[PDB]
């Protein structure tokens, strides 16, 4: 097919500026009509630039496009937390109806304040327990940077099976969220004295505990 080469990822500091390149040939980027798109997970693609330099309606002034030969550049100034996203260039090739997208770039914005995780641990419901199953749900939110490790415990000892933990994903406030699930039988739930969800973030651990016999 054809490839518009972008750096896999780039980073810039808060309030500062960053550039993302888009390298192709003379048959795509050389046509002098490059476009740029912003992708935030859980949201639809958003058009930033078209025709090398023209900003789409509603796009702030701090997004600017340029092109020198067969390499286009997206420049973002005054970086904010909400600019952390994936960015894709694009260009027609051999036809206005044959669009080619770039390999994509992930932008990180450094210098944001660290935020510890808020942790909420839910016990299994009575409804689920009547069907002889028990799911413990550990919801993890408002943490930055967007990486945590989760450890489950029963009566103080590490649980080594039937744990599933999601990846971290970005929230509407540019912090991260994640969740972890412990799948038990109703018998397991009642037998142990306690269960814990331990969430480690930047070397600091937050633990929530529930006690079956006292959960009601």
């Amino acid at each position: 097919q054809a490839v518009l080469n972008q750096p896999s990822s780039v980073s810039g500091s808060l309030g500062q500026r960053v550039s993302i390149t888009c390298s192709g040939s003379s048959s795509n980027v050389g046509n002098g009509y490059v476009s740029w798109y912003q992708l935030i997970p859980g949201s639809a693609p958003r058009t930033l630039i078209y025709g090398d330099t023209s900003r789409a309606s509603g796009v702030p002034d701090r997004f600017s496009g340029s092109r020198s030969g067969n390499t286009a550049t997206l420049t973002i100034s005054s970086l904010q937390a909400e600019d952390e996203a994936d960015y894709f260039c694009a260009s027609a090739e051999d036809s206005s109806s044959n669009a080619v997208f770039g390999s994509g770039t992930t932008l990180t914005v450094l210098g944001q304040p660290k935020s510890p995780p808020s942790v909420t641990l839910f016990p299994p419901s009575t409804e689920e327990l009547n069907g002889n199953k028990a799911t413990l749900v550990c919801l993890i939110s408002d943490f930055y940077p967007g990486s945590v490790t989760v450890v489950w415990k029963a009566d103080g000892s590490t649980i080594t099976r039937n744990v599933e933990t999601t990846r971290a994903s970005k929230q509407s406030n540019s912090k991260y969220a994640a969740s972890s699930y412990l799948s038990l039988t109703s018998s397991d739930w009642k037998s142990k004295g306690s269960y814990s969800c331990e969430v480690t973030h930047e070397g600091s651990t937050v633990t929530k505990t529930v006690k079956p016999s006292e959960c009601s």
Binding site: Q1, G32, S96, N98, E128, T135
Partner: protein, 262 residues
């Protein structure tokens, strides 16, 4: 300008995936873009006002796009699908134009006024008199493409697995487990397939203080997700009902979530 994709969220391998886009606030060329999980945006094709179609060359043999101005809708068809066709499919409005130009400090022979009309030259006088510094080139074509408006997109999963509607369970904290001033309630949307599910609270009337988490995929192949709502201690008399919709199974579930009386 709004675009609305519609179609099945689940299809089996070797089947034909058929999608529809509904346009409102307009009549402009429409295109289809997809993004498979983990992959880049990928062009599929388009159909303009004149009704001419263009496709991603590498996928063309598997694609077909038609339109119906009366119903104000555009269709997409993808044949012989595999798991590689699992993706979010976006209906879009696209700009498509083809401007003939000369590449550099080259100008059309047309504009020189003599030599009539052909291709391109670097300088009218030089190529008119045939001076050694004259440079000629054929006319070149500049192709313009960009996406104006995007639909929110339709998630399509290619799988042979049957649908499984979710079991929805109430989430409430254990007794004694921290009467912080704020209470947290939620719904566990358990053991379904495929994605997605839509969760609202109180029939969508409640949006503030709602936190819906991405799904976890169990090794059983079934998804589970949770949505929680925060409630100030000051609050009283409010009911909290999560409304869970699962398009693949055409199921909608309403679960009332109570704090434990303790």
């Amino acid at each position: 300008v709004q675009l609305r994709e519609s179609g099945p969220s689940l299809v089996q391998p070797s089947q034909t995936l058929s999608l529809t886009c509904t346009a409102s606030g307009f009549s402009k060329a429409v295109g289809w873009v997809r993004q498979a999980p983990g992959k880049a945006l990928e062009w599929l094709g388009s159909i303009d006002t004149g009704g001419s179609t263009g496709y991603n060359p590498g996928l063309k043999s598997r694609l077909s796009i038609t339109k119906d101005n009366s119903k104000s809708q555009v269709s997409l068809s993808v044949s012989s699908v595999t798991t590689e066709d699992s993706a979010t499919y976006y209906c879009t409005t696209v700009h498509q134009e083809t401007r003939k130009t000369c590449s550099d400090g080259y100008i059309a022979v047309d504009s020189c006024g003599r030599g009539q009309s052909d291709g391109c030259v670097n300088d009218c006088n030089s190529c008119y008199y045939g001076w050694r510094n004259c440079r000629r080139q054929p006319a070149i074509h500049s192709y313009e493409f960009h996406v104006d408006a995007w639909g929110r997109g339709l998630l399509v999963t290619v799988s042979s697995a049957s649908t499984t509607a979710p079991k929805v369970y109430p989430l409430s904290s254990c007794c004694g487990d921290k009467s912080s001033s704020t209470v947290t309630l939620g719904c566990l949307v358990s053991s379904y397939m495929p994605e997605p599910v839509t969760v609202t609270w109180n029939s969508g009337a409640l949006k503030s203080g709602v936190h819906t988490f991405p799904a976890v995929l169990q090794s059983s192949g079934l998804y589970s997700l949770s949505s929680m709502v925060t409630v100030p201690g000051s609050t009283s008399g409010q009911t909290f009902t999560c409304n869970v919709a699962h398009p693949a199974s055409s199921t909608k579930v309403d679960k009332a979530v109570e704090p434990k009386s303790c």
